[PDB]
Amino acid sequence: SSYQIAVLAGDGIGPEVMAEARKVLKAVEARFGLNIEYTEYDVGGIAIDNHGCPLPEATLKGCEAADAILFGSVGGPKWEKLPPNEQPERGALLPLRGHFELFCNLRPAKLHDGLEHMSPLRSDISARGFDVLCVRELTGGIYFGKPKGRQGEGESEEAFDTMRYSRREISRIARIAFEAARGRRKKVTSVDKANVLACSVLWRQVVEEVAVDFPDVELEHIYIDNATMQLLRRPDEFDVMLCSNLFGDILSDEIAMLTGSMGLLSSASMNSTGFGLFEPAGGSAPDIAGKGIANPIAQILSAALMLRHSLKQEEAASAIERAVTKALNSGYLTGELLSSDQRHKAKTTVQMGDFIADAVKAGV
Amino acid sequence: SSYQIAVLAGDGIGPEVMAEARKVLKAVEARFGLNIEYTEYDVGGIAIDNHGCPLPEATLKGCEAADAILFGSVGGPKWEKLPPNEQPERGALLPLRGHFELFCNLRPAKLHDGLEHMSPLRSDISARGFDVLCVRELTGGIYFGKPKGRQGEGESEEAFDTMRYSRREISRIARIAFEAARGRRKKVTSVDKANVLACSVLWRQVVEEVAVDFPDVELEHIYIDNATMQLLRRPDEFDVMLCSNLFGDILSDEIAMLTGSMGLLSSASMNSTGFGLFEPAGGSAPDIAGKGIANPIAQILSAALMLRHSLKQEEAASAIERAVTKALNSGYLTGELLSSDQRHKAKTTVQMGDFIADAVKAGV
Numbered sequence A, B: 001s002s003y004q005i006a007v008l009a010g011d012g013i014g015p016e017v018m019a020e021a022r023k024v025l026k027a028v029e030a031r032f033g034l035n036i037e038y039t040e041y042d043v044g045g046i047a048i049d050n051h052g053c054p055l056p057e058a059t060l061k062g063c064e065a066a067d068a069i070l071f072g073s074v075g076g077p078k079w080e081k082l083p084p085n086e087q088p089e090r091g092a093l094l095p096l097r098g099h100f101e102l103f104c105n106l107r108p109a110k111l112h113d114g115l116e117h118m119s120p121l122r123s124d125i126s127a128r129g130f131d132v133l134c135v136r137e138l139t140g141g142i143y144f145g146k147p148k149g150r151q152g153e154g155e156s157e158e159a160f161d162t163m164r165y166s167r168r169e170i171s172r173i174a175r176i177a178f179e180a181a182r183g184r185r186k187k188v189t190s191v192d193k194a195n196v197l198a199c200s201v202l203w204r205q206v207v208e209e210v211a212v213d214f215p216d217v218e219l220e221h222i223y224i225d226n227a228t229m230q231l232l233r234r235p236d237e238f239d240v241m242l243c244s245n246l247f248g249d250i251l252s253d254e255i256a257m258l259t260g261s262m263g264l265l266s267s268a269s270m271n272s273t274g275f276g277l278f279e280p281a282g283g284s285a286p287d288i289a290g291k292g293i294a295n296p297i298a299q300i301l302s303a304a305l306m307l308r309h310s311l312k313q314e315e316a317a318s319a320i321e322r323a324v325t326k327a328l329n330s331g332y333l334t335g336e337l338l339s340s341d342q343r344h345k346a347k348t349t350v351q352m353g354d355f356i357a358d359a360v361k362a363g364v
Ligand SMILES: CC(C)[C@H](C(=O)O)[C@@H](O)C(=O)O
Pocket: A089, A090, A093, A094, A249, B195, B196, B225
């Protein structure tokens, strides 16, 4: 029946790429007969300007009344001299994850055929391609562990954060990783620092416990310092990477940057009900905002992840994905995906959204 | 007068590259009139085989009686199924750092002229070159913070580690970073996660306090997830990177792997007295051990760092560095530094050590 989406476009290019995601969604709604209602709420920088804080009470409550959050990007110059701890990005994202128990972050990243040369990797390495799904635990570990704070003064003033994980928190993120590997290349690489951290000793232990239910999936463990090196040499050997909160933050962004094409990358953060927050992997790109230059594909693929994971509409989600593939192989590329001698073939944000939506309309 | 070095060659290629470092040191001792006595002690894997643990009491005591530790590499297949927490590398390295208060880790990494093509970076990026010094805080933060451990059972069993930093611990590592920038390109990039961690809020605060004493050095702050991406796009823009224990672990290894030439990279871990532990950046490479293939240059440059930082012998240290430069630009390269169509020009470990030592002898 009727789905309700909270739309939180945020700052920078958020609103302009959101417009294209909505246009594509409208074509999907028509093609598949879905009834989806959308309400927009302020978040991030615009919420600080309009309401005094990055996550107003009204926005939080509109997310509670929704089936999913279609989220843009938050932050920029204007607020980047507030304390790092009252800044819009951490002030929007961390309480949304904590409040809705969005323990699971999925970040699919691949080198697209024909775009290998944009990876900052050496040509013989990018030619091999890669397709790496990062599964990051999002509501535990050092981000929300207590005690957190500071005590004392002067030279002996100290600050502390506590990384904490229970077996239950580890096993539920690990099962997601194994379940995902099962449908891909059947390998989970679990990433920890078990030679140093008590949380990582438990992590590796519990991942090995969960593994018994997946005898068809290969499991390997790697230290985070070694994983950050190995992704530079053989990223084609990884399938699913399984990580705790802080190691996942670092590793998923390293992998994204390895694609050289962040404008194509989206992100799902979900709870066990399948309520989630769907966002592009990259930032608010405030210098390009309002110019029709931003690549909307990341925000469009966010909507496809939303349709799949929160709304259980697998066909709708894959239609959008294929409309994106069709754009990428039919010469519909924005300026950041072109070598600068070809930068004159660039499509605008609106041209991309129009093409993608017409492709869904035409039955792609 | 007479210096005393504890030699802890460890496992794998440790002993064979150590032999070359000692040969080079002998030439430096003759050229500069230094009296250096060396005693060897077991550490790591060989210590587990010979003494039941990775850091025997006799080894610890021989390090206490020395002016510096010239350290090889620990670990390998044979011990890699003990608990990650009784393994040789963490079992040797963490108690040595804690016992001697080796708070400062320096890892100099550069792309050497002529070896750019070995970097896993895209050719236009490696052509630009880079020279990045990582300064990592080594005895604080989450590695040695308490409470650390676990409690409970079953699903609610939990583990915890505590990241802790005081202003005094931050200011002494930061002054090292600023002092080092002052002699290089005069920029410190401090790396934290101040949007999430109480330790990082204090970190960034205190680094800004220390900065007042260095008005000639530029200071910028970057989040660790952003630093791991940016090193892939503009590593030539960084000079000194300043990091806490866990972020430094990750970032220094990412930078090392970016050079594509780990066999050239060394590491200094020092206390405030200038006692230190000097080691190659890479591992024990157990599959190549005993074959004369390993590149000894990392271990030779460890000895130069030892001469400079612990023994206050700047001239001796720079003679070794220049002997290494001469090798690299005179066709003296080991097999891993050659493109495989040139792998027939490879020098052995002994040929490299002989060349480098003769270069010091000849007055390089
Ligand atoms: C804004 C910050 C708290 C956040 C994180 O650390 O999770 C961001 O880096 C991300 O990856 O979503």
